[PDB]
Amino acid sequence: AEKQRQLKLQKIYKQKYIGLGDESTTREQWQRNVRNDTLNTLQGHSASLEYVSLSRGDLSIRDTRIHLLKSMSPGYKAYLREE
Amino acid sequence: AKDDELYLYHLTLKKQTNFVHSCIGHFVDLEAGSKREQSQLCVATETHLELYDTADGELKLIAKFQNLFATITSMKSLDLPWPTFLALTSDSGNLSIVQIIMHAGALRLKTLVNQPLTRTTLRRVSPISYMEIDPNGRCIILSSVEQNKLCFLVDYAQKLRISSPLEIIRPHMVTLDMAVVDVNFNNPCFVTLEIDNAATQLSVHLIFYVLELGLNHIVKKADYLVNPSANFVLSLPDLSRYN
Amino acid sequence: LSKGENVPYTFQDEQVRSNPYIYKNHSGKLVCKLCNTMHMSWSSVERHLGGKKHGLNVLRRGISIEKSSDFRQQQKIIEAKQSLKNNGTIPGSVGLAIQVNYSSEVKENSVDSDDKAKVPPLIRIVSGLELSDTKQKGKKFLVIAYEPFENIAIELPPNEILFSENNDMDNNNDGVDELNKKCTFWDAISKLYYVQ
Amino acid sequence: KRRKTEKPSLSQLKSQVPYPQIIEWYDCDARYPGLLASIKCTKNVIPVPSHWQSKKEYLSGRSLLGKRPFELPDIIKKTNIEQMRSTLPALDLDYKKLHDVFFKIGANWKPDHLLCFGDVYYENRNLFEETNWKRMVDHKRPGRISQELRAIMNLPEGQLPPWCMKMKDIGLPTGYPDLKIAGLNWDITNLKGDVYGKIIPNHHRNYFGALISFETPEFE
Amino acid sequence: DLMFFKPSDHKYFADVISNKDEKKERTLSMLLLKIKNGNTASRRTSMRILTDKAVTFGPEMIFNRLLPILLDRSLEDQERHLMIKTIDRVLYQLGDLTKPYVHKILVVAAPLLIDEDPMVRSTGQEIITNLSTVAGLKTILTVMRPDIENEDEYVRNVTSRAAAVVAKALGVNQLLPFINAACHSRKSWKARHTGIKIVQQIGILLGIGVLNHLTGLMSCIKDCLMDDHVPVRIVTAHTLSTLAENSYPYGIEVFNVVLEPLWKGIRSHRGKVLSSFLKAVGSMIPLMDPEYAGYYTTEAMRIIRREFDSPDDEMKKTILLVLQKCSAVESITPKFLREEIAPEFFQKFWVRRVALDRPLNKVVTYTTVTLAKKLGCSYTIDKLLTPLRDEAEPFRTMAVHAVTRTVNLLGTADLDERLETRLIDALLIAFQEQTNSDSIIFKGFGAVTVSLDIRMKPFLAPIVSTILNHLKHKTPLVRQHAADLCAILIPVIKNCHEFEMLNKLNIILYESLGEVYPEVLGSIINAMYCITSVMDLDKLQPPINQILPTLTPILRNKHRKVEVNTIKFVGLIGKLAPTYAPPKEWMRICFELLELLKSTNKEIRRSANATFGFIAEAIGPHDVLVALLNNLKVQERQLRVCTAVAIGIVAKVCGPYNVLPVIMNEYTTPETNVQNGVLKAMSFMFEYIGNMSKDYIYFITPLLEDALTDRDLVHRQTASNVITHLALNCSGTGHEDAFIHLMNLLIPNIFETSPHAIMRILEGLEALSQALGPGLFMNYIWAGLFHPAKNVRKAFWRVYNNMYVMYQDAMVPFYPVTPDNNEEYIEELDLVL
Amino acid sequence: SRHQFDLIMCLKQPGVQTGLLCEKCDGKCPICDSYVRPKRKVRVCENCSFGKQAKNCIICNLNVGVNDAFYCWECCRLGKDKDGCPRILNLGSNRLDRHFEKK
Ligand SMILES: [Zn+2]
Ligand SMILES: [Zn+2]
Ligand SMILES: [Zn+2]
Ligand SMILES: [Zn+2]
């Protein structure tokens, strides 16, 4: 009953907050959540976004932001490779 | 024994100067008994907030408002059919619609309604960082970089009233560059660029949404796949003369 | 159910206990230090004691001790018989001899149901280190016992007397012990017990 | 089956690891062993308490039977309620007294043991003995012998320990080069009581946060 | 024990009256009997065994033996629900069932939705919503098709609701084409009918959620409404009512299709058909566009006025609903209503025979109140003065209700002096003349008196004359009724500065305080509470210090309300009057409450705990703590817990510097239950102090040292509960080094099972996340994050789930991720400028 | 709920509306059921309000509440304040066996 509720709240929290490791989670599934949240905060704070912009040396800052956005999806590596 | 316990007193001597958000509304009427002019701007950097006027062709400090102690992740003014007060979204998920008022001998920033959304942190599920308001001010829309999008239907009365949120949830679609199209009162329509989070290939596809005031929900309209190279969207107002 | 006994807490730094095992820990619960089992009520404690589990741990603890290195129905009129001590001598040293006499078919006429009736009186050497009063001690006693009559003792200050060396030719009917077979006689026909 | 038999040897896993001694035999069945070795062997991570894989529900401890019920922190024991109410097998006290015990007397007070960054409490552990240990490494120093151990040693006052003679032939302790003892490197007339010698150090602030004043909040 | 044998249902079980399939076969039915007919202690065990082994037993025998049991007529609401609970737990356990047994279970638990009580309606919904996920869409759809064609009105009604619950559970998008099947089916008439009702209960259950799905349903309304069948046409009209009310004004754009045929149905079919149609259109009225509202309202109001004379009940109920909704229309003017609608309303619908039936009286009153908004309040109440003085008592009751709901919204400020006089006159008449026993008159009368107050004084005197007049009476009903009216009228008298009059009230009530009837005595003490609260203590007549010692015996009166108002009032004297009552008398209070809180009431028990704060402020805190700690030794859990609450509140008002040292000794006491009461009392005393515990934290940690280390999962549990509040309110103070310790003792407890232990420990660790910050708390979680053990993993991913819920950005810097750790890593973290 | 396990919550994005609780449940933080230092008024999604069900106590789901429910300061910091819409959809085994127990 109680654990059974914890299963439903597992489904709800997983739905809202996306990745939540339940019991068995592949390193590909979880590391993707890591990358997504790290990039999420790098672009999310105007602070760290301004920082990565200069240290990277891009011509504009939104290039870095939308870069991180694109970098969230896995295929973006091969996308850069095809440029 | 003397406790080391260094006690530090933090002060911000000069306040954060990188201006991440702006709004065009006319907030306070100052030094003039009766005047209404749309020329004024309020600009926000995260915590710090400032309000400038021009009216002379030369910009002017109005007042530097008190420190909000949060990260403002988007700010947009709203104009409803009145004093134009700005809708402000930040961390805590709260949608905080604030009106700049003149209280005592200074300009203070009063809040009207703050609606709890997500949790308190900078998050991807957090319906912030992408915000826009109907150019006629009928509805405000917040979205998340990834998970979900919420759109409130704003109504004014003797007291301001924020309608219940309108939810759309696309699990794997990472949202970027919210841009809302103006309308003639027909129906609010907003446009986004959704990049799929989980996919074998990189696919960036634009998607249109028409919020239906009649059925009270957001409707996916046209999903157009464009090259992964996509950057941003802007709204062309009418093309009423052309076809 | 506690029978009014006081079980001190484990932390009270040990009056003799009935069983020096069941204790109460820092909390109110009762525990068996050997078994390391917690028990809610004294009834559960008694179930533990009457259980095979606790017993096994008791045998294991006794094995640890060795590693570290009819009684009920016994009639008792407690009647002092008559002894006849006498300094003896043979060759080549000096030994003691006792002549204990018993009833003359006076009261033994009511009990004849072959209940150890065939068992003769028995002698044992006891150290005074243990007495009902525990006051003074340091010498041995040559106790002699018979079912109905009362026990009898004889003090032996001399460390050793008449303690012989292979008297007979090593025949093995232990009876009770080497002492009894070696040097006792039971004239059962006349009811006279001689010991030397 | 095949995945269970596909596992690399733990020693094959050691080479991938900068701190190989943390990895253990059960890490072979780690579903992602190359990753789990990196996480577990990452700098500041604190390995899982090892009471798992035991079915004893983490406390069967025999030592748990012999743990003391409780002891008041001496500062609170000063408050004397110990005598006012007998906890072992009305009581009104002064507000200023109690308030000052926590604040005036006990502001700088802190528990003596606590624990450290990676300290984890295993079942068989008992902190108290390690508290007396740390306190003892503090009080007791070489050259001094308490009167109890002195009486057990049967050493009368004014007489040097028996290892001072063998220390005369063998030499000063290699661990204590600065140690001084009466009669040898140190003045015998300074022999007093329990101290027959002392280490003489050859070595001979404000920390930016020095408060320079201490004022506690007053109740009144 | 098999308590309460059932001869017929047991001989129906047969089986064992005195082979693995025979052993499971027997023990299973034996357990089922334990649940149905048995002992509470027995059935509670058979539930746990039946759920634990529910996966082991074959659902074939489970449902085969279990289901037909509920088919008998000898079942009782108790026992039938005892089997229902097993149905829910087993269905949610196995999670997969074949379609024939799905049909059986759905037929068995299907009638539950129709039962009169929402208690049974709820669980009847639970079985179906749990079964929906088990069987799935296709199975249930194959189940309803042969049933909707049944000729039985009862069963059709049943699986209408059942099908609705399914549609809500699995969504109405998946089940919607089925709705189109029975909806648009040309074959069967009853299939059309029930196919329409399913839309009703779907609309009711979804509520506002019907909006996004409202397109497909209105298809069925527009196409199936045109059927020549009168019942079909009626049910469609009801669906428009439900879907409009639940719709809310949004859906007009969709309802515009069915808007047209309703009117041509109205002007033609009339009768009950026009009743349902005007119900539908009436529900459409609020959602209509202002211009369209203007037109269609004016179109309907004529039919309404013409239909005022309808002898039928249903049509009158509908008319009142249509007026109710049309009142909100801005188009029709309050002048229009007062000139035409209102006068033809009050005369027709207020006839005495109207007041006879409650379910109609509801709609009458609510309709009248909705009229009061547009109509002038003085005009409405003006028409409402004559019904107040009628000699029919229930008609006087309805007359009161209208005044209550009307005056609450609008207020009486619109009324002139004269009709304001006649109002209070009527209220006093009906109040003193009331025959029936009902609680409304003093409530609503009090609402009027709160509405108009300064104006009451010349009436305020005679009202109190009636008050005392009823305070002496031979009927306890009128007694407690008048007393309840007193307590309500007390605050108003303050506005007239009658205070001596409050004094004589305090006198008479205090003298009648010795009444035998508890039900009245409680209300009397409530009036005492209002009096003492309102008026200054010094000028109180009895006075207070004479009042309370007469209250001390009252606490033993048992019942409930007596201790409710008694503890309330003793608390009132507790905060207001510290000096008057002597401290020894306060100690008698402490003993009496300490004995009193064994009561089963959470209000009595909570307020009882709250009064110890006032008693601790007035009298010696140590003096209170002696009795409290002495009461901790009692075995009863309510005593232990709520004495711990008392210790907490006393520690809040007095401050922990007094209470905590003695608490720690009470923990030094070896007794378990006492130690538990100590730890919980420590939890509560910490949650009541936000900023205080920061200075007290260090003295706590040596106590939690023996707590968290203790072998008892209870002590570890409640100690963790201490760490929750203590860590939350002390977080960020700089005690993290102590928090580090406290956590270091917690981590080993993560693997501890049981629901209470696991949730207390989770909440504790989450509180530690705030005081330590994720980084270290992370470090533990990381070094245990994956692990082979399949158990350790499941345990720590719970803590990491909660951590990911509260913190995400907070954990971002703390992910132990390096380019050799993961393939892609992130190229932008190594950038340095 | 914190105590009764089988009670199910809503957890949707809260709307502008404020949840009501009855005088019987007055004072409880709807998550932890704590009586201390309440902070922010509960907000429920529109799907939990609509008609008569809006008047129900968001805690006990049965009685009609006058008072507004507030989150405590411990839940407001734990963030459960913003988790979602608190409501109790199922009446729960306790209340059920209570009603069937009496009648
Ligand atoms: Zn044992
Ligand atoms: Zn909700
Ligand atoms: Zn309630
Ligand atoms: Zn709370």
CSV table of N, CA and C in Angstrom, one decimal, chain E residues 113-185:
chain,number,residue,atom,x,y,z
E,113,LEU,N,-21.5,2.0,-7.6
E,113,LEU,CA,-21.6,3.4,-7.9
E,113,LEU,C,-23.0,4.0,-7.7
E,114,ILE,N,-24.0,3.1,-7.7
E,114,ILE,CA,-25.4,3.6,-7.6
E,114,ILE,C,-25.9,3.7,-6.2
E,115,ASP,N,-25.1,3.1,-5.2
E,115,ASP,CA,-25.6,3.1,-3.8
E,115,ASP,C,-25.7,4.6,-3.3
E,116,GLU,N,-26.6,4.8,-2.4
E,116,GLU,CA,-27.0,6.1,-2.0
E,116,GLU,C,-25.9,6.9,-1.3
E,117,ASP,N,-24.9,6.2,-0.7
E,117,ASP,CA,-23.9,6.9,0.0
E,117,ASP,C,-22.6,7.0,-0.8
E,118,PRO,N,-22.0,8.2,-0.8
E,118,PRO,CA,-20.7,8.4,-1.5
E,118,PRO,C,-19.6,7.6,-0.9
E,119,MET,N,-19.8,7.1,0.4
E,119,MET,CA,-18.9,6.2,0.9
E,119,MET,C,-18.7,4.9,0.1
E,120,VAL,N,-19.8,4.3,-0.3
E,120,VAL,CA,-19.8,3.2,-1.2
E,120,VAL,C,-19.5,3.6,-2.6
E,121,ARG,N,-20.1,4.8,-3.1
E,121,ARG,CA,-19.7,5.3,-4.4
E,121,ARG,C,-18.2,5.4,-4.6
E,122,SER,N,-17.5,5.8,-3.6
E,122,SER,CA,-16.1,6.0,-3.7
E,122,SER,C,-15.3,4.7,-4.0
E,123,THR,N,-15.5,3.7,-3.1
E,123,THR,CA,-14.8,2.5,-3.3
E,123,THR,C,-15.3,1.8,-4.6
E,124,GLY,N,-16.6,1.9,-5.0
E,124,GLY,CA,-17.0,1.4,-6.2
E,124,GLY,C,-16.3,2.0,-7.4
E,125,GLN,N,-16.0,3.3,-7.3
E,125,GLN,CA,-15.1,3.9,-8.3
E,125,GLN,C,-13.7,3.4,-8.2
E,126,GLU,N,-13.2,3.1,-7.0
E,126,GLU,CA,-11.8,2.7,-6.9
E,126,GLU,C,-11.6,1.3,-7.5
E,127,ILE,N,-12.5,0.4,-7.3
E,127,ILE,CA,-12.3,-0.9,-7.9
E,127,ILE,C,-12.3,-0.8,-9.5
E,128,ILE,N,-13.1,0.1,-10.0
E,128,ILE,CA,-13.2,0.2,-11.5
E,128,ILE,C,-12.0,0.9,-12.0
E,129,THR,N,-11.5,2.0,-11.3
E,129,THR,CA,-10.4,2.7,-11.8
E,129,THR,C,-9.1,1.9,-11.6
E,130,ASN,N,-9.1,1.0,-10.7
E,130,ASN,CA,-7.9,0.1,-10.6
E,130,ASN,C,-8.0,-1.0,-11.6
E,131,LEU,N,-9.2,-1.5,-11.9
E,131,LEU,CA,-9.4,-2.6,-12.9
E,131,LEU,C,-9.1,-2.1,-14.3
E,132,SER,N,-9.3,-0.8,-14.6
E,132,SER,CA,-9.1,-0.3,-15.9
E,132,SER,C,-7.7,-0.5,-16.4
E,133,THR,N,-6.7,-0.1,-15.5
E,133,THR,CA,-5.3,-0.3,-15.9
E,133,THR,C,-5.0,-1.8,-16.1
E,134,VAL,N,-5.7,-2.6,-15.3
E,134,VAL,CA,-5.5,-4.1,-15.4
E,134,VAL,C,-5.9,-4.7,-16.7
E,135,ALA,N,-7.2,-4.5,-17.1
E,135,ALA,CA,-7.7,-5.1,-18.3
E,135,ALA,C,-7.3,-4.3,-19.5
E,136,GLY,N,-7.5,-3.0,-19.5
E,136,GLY,CA,-7.1,-2.2,-20.7
E,136,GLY,C,-8.3,-1.7,-21.4
E,137,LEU,N,-8.1,-0.9,-22.5
E,137,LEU,CA,-9.1,-0.3,-23.3
E,137,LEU,C,-10.0,-1.4,-24.0
E,138,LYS,N,-9.3,-2.3,-24.8
E,138,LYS,CA,-10.0,-3.2,-25.6
E,138,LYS,C,-10.9,-4.1,-24.8
E,139,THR,N,-10.4,-4.7,-23.7
E,139,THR,CA,-11.1,-5.6,-22.9
E,139,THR,C,-12.4,-5.0,-22.4
E,140,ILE,N,-12.3,-3.8,-21.8
E,140,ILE,CA,-13.5,-3.2,-21.2
E,140,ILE,C,-14.5,-2.8,-22.3
E,141,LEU,N,-14.0,-2.3,-23.4
E,141,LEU,CA,-14.9,-2.0,-24.5
E,141,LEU,C,-15.6,-3.3,-25.0
E,142,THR,N,-14.9,-4.4,-25.1
E,142,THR,CA,-15.6,-5.7,-25.4
E,142,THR,C,-16.6,-6.1,-24.3
E,143,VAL,N,-16.4,-5.6,-23.0
E,143,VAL,CA,-17.3,-5.9,-22.0
E,143,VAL,C,-18.6,-5.1,-22.0
E,144,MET,N,-18.5,-3.8,-22.3
E,144,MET,CA,-19.7,-2.9,-22.3
E,144,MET,C,-20.6,-3.2,-23.5
E,145,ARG,N,-20.1,-3.6,-24.6
E,145,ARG,CA,-20.9,-3.7,-25.8
E,145,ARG,C,-22.1,-4.7,-25.6
E,146,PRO,N,-21.9,-5.9,-25.2
E,146,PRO,CA,-23.1,-6.8,-25.0
E,146,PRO,C,-24.0,-6.3,-23.8
E,147,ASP,N,-23.5,-5.5,-22.9
E,147,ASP,CA,-24.3,-5.0,-21.8
E,147,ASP,C,-25.2,-3.9,-22.1
E,148,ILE,N,-24.7,-2.9,-22.9
E,148,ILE,CA,-25.5,-1.7,-23.3
E,148,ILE,C,-26.7,-2.2,-24.0
E,149,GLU,N,-26.7,-3.3,-24.7
E,149,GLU,CA,-27.9,-3.8,-25.4
E,149,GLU,C,-28.9,-4.5,-24.4
E,150,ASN,N,-28.6,-4.6,-23.2
E,150,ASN,CA,-29.5,-5.2,-22.2
E,150,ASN,C,-30.8,-4.4,-22.1
E,151,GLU,N,-31.9,-5.1,-21.8
E,151,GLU,CA,-33.2,-4.5,-21.7
E,151,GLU,C,-33.4,-4.0,-20.2
E,152,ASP,N,-32.5,-4.2,-19.4
E,152,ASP,CA,-32.7,-3.9,-17.9
E,152,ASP,C,-32.3,-2.4,-17.7
E,153,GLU,N,-33.2,-1.6,-17.3
E,153,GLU,CA,-32.9,-0.2,-16.9
E,153,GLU,C,-31.9,-0.1,-15.8
E,154,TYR,N,-32.1,-1.0,-14.8
E,154,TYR,CA,-31.1,-1.0,-13.7
E,154,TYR,C,-29.7,-1.2,-14.2
E,155,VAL,N,-29.4,-2.3,-14.8
E,155,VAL,CA,-28.1,-2.6,-15.3
E,155,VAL,C,-27.5,-1.6,-16.3
E,156,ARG,N,-28.4,-1.1,-17.2
E,156,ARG,CA,-28.0,-0.1,-18.1
E,156,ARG,C,-27.5,1.2,-17.3
E,157,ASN,N,-28.3,1.6,-16.3
E,157,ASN,CA,-27.9,2.7,-15.5
E,157,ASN,C,-26.5,2.4,-14.8
E,158,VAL,N,-26.3,1.1,-14.4
E,158,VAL,CA,-25.1,0.7,-13.7
E,158,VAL,C,-23.9,0.9,-14.6
E,159,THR,N,-23.9,0.2,-15.7
E,159,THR,CA,-22.7,0.3,-16.6
E,159,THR,C,-22.6,1.6,-17.3
E,160,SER,N,-23.6,2.5,-17.3
E,160,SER,CA,-23.4,3.9,-17.7
E,160,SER,C,-22.4,4.5,-16.8
E,161,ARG,N,-22.6,4.5,-15.5
E,161,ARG,CA,-21.6,5.0,-14.5
E,161,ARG,C,-20.3,4.3,-14.6
E,162,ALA,N,-20.4,3.0,-14.6
E,162,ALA,CA,-19.1,2.2,-14.7
E,162,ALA,C,-18.3,2.6,-15.9
E,163,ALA,N,-19.0,2.6,-17.1
E,163,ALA,CA,-18.3,3.0,-18.3
E,163,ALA,C,-17.7,4.4,-18.2
E,164,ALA,N,-18.4,5.3,-17.5
E,164,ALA,CA,-17.9,6.7,-17.2
E,164,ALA,C,-16.6,6.6,-16.4
E,165,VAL,N,-16.6,5.8,-15.3
E,165,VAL,CA,-15.4,5.7,-14.5
E,165,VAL,C,-14.2,5.2,-15.3
E,166,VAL,N,-14.5,4.2,-16.2
E,166,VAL,CA,-13.5,3.7,-17.1
E,166,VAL,C,-13.0,4.8,-18.0
E,167,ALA,N,-13.9,5.6,-18.6
E,167,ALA,CA,-13.5,6.6,-19.5
E,167,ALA,C,-12.6,7.6,-18.8
E,168,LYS,N,-12.9,7.9,-17.5
E,168,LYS,CA,-12.0,8.9,-16.8
E,168,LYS,C,-10.7,8.2,-16.4
E,169,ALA,N,-10.7,6.9,-16.1
E,169,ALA,CA,-9.5,6.3,-15.7
E,169,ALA,C,-8.5,6.1,-16.8
E,170,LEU,N,-8.9,5.5,-18.0
E,170,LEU,CA,-8.1,5.4,-19.1
E,170,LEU,C,-8.1,6.5,-20.1
E,171,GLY,N,-8.8,7.6,-19.7
E,171,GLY,CA,-9.0,8.7,-20.6
E,171,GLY,C,-10.2,8.5,-21.6
E,172,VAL,N,-10.8,9.7,-22.0
E,172,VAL,CA,-12.0,9.6,-22.8
E,172,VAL,C,-11.6,9.7,-24.3
E,173,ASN,N,-10.3,10.0,-24.5
E,173,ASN,CA,-9.9,10.0,-25.9
E,173,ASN,C,-9.8,8.6,-26.5
E,174,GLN,N,-9.3,7.6,-25.7
E,174,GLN,CA,-9.3,6.2,-26.1
E,174,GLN,C,-10.6,5.6,-26.2
E,175,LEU,N,-11.5,5.9,-25.2
E,175,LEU,CA,-12.8,5.3,-25.1
E,175,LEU,C,-13.8,6.1,-26.0
E,176,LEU,N,-13.4,7.2,-26.5
E,176,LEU,CA,-14.4,8.1,-27.2
E,176,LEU,C,-15.0,7.4,-28.5
E,177,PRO,N,-14.3,6.7,-29.3
E,177,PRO,CA,-15.0,6.1,-30.5
E,177,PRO,C,-16.0,5.1,-30.0
E,178,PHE,N,-15.8,4.4,-28.9
E,178,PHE,CA,-16.9,3.6,-28.3
E,178,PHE,C,-18.1,4.4,-28.0
E,179,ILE,N,-17.9,5.6,-27.4
E,179,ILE,CA,-19.0,6.5,-27.1
E,179,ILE,C,-19.7,6.9,-28.4
E,180,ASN,N,-18.9,7.0,-29.5
E,180,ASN,CA,-19.5,7.2,-30.8
E,180,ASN,C,-20.3,6.0,-31.3
E,181,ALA,N,-19.9,4.8,-30.9
E,181,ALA,CA,-20.6,3.6,-31.3
E,181,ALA,C,-21.9,3.5,-30.6
E,182,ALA,N,-22.0,3.5,-29.3
E,182,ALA,CA,-23.3,3.4,-28.6
E,182,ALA,C,-24.1,4.7,-28.8
E,183,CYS,N,-23.4,5.8,-28.8
E,183,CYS,CA,-24.0,7.1,-29.2
E,183,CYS,C,-24.7,7.0,-30.5
E,184,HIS,N,-24.0,6.9,-31.6
E,184,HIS,CA,-24.6,7.0,-32.9
E,184,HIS,C,-25.3,5.7,-33.4
E,185,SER,N,-25.3,4.7,-32.6
E,185,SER,CA,-25.8,3.4,-33.0
E,185,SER,C,-27.3,3.6,-33.5
